[PDB]
Design a protein around this motif. Structure first.
Motif, PDB file in Angstrom:
ATOM      1  N   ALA A  53       2.166   4.134  -1.347  1.00 22.82           N
ATOM      2  CA  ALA A  53       0.882   4.181  -2.109  1.00 22.82           C
ATOM      3  C   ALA A  53       0.459   5.746  -2.238  1.00 22.82           C
ATOM      4  CB  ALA A  53      -0.160   3.348  -1.388  1.00 22.82           C
ATOM      5  N   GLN A 110       2.260   7.632  -4.734  1.00 24.97           N
ATOM      6  CA  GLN A 110       1.871   7.178  -6.104  1.00 24.97           C
ATOM      7  C   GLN A 110       0.467   7.790  -6.582  1.00 24.97           C
ATOM      8  OE1 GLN A 110       3.925   5.306  -8.552  1.00 24.97           O
ATOM      9  NE2 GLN A 110       2.022   6.150  -9.857  1.00 24.97           N
ATOM     10  N   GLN A 111      -0.547   7.816  -5.514  1.00 21.80           N
ATOM     11  CA  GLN A 111      -1.776   8.055  -5.827  1.00 21.80           C
ATOM     12  C   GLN A 111      -2.259   9.565  -5.624  1.00 21.80           C
ATOM     13  OE1 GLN A 111      -4.802   5.579  -4.384  1.00 21.80           O
ATOM     14  NE2 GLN A 111      -3.553   3.836  -4.209  1.00 21.80           N
TER      15      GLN A 111
END
Lengths: 127, 132
Positions: B91, B94-95
């Motif tokens: 995550a 991704q972020q």
């Protein structure tokens, strides 16, 4: 002055492959200190693994199993160097040399990551 | 060939960190950047809460980060430390923006390697006699 994680590991790496059979008491004394500092940087679980490995080392004297176990446990929680000092006074040179050389080699070989996919990714980073 | 491959050892882990701590990673491939995140995450779980919070406090102090930028970095330390199945790591990949990730990894690796292990003068002096 301050000793870092990196210098601790580079120092261990250097001395792990040296033949220390004939080195002076002064450097052997310091090598014990190195091992003691290292034991306290490991967790209970990490230290238990190192200890188990040591105890399983081929060609070591089985009489020394309990003494060696005790050294791992007592160095890990050694306060102002009391146990380390007693260990220096009481153990003979041969036993100290054997313990130190095994310790340094085993500590460095400590498995840190065993997940196949993570290991594969990390291997691409190894210089 | 083997079904049970060799683990990454402490030595290899530290030698790898040392090598990459010294590199300018601003222009490296994504594939290597992603593995560097994994390296840092592995290290976060090797350190005790004691060692990790010192690393983290030091990171934030050295960068002099204000609240809006410091708290995410703190969250990164906490959630990598407690990560399971590489879920927060993925995550984060991704972020987070590439730049913040690059800055984080460089500071993480350099500070981790420079962590103080002993400051007792008699011990430091003793250990200095051993340095190659």
């Amino acid at each position: 002055g301050a000793i870092t994680l990196l210098t601790l590991i580079k120092t261990a790496e250097h001395w792990a492959r040296q033949d220390i059979r004939t080195i002076e008491d002064s450097k052997l004394r310091a090598l014990l200190t190195l091992c003691a500092v290292m034991t306290r940087k490991f967790s209970k679980s990490q230290l238990s693994l190192l200890c188990e490995t040591h105890l399983r080392r081929e060609g070591l004297g089985q009489d020394q199993a309990e003494p060696v176990l005790e050294v791992y446990q007592r160095l890990h929680s050694d306060k102002g160097g009391s146990f380390e000092a007693a260990l220096w006074q009481q153990w003979d040179r041969q036993s100290l040399i054997m313990f130190i050389t095994a310790f340094l080699n085993i500590a460095l070989q400590l498995p840190c990551e065993s997940s196949a996919v993570v290991v594969s990714g990390l291997r691409t980073l190894v210089p």
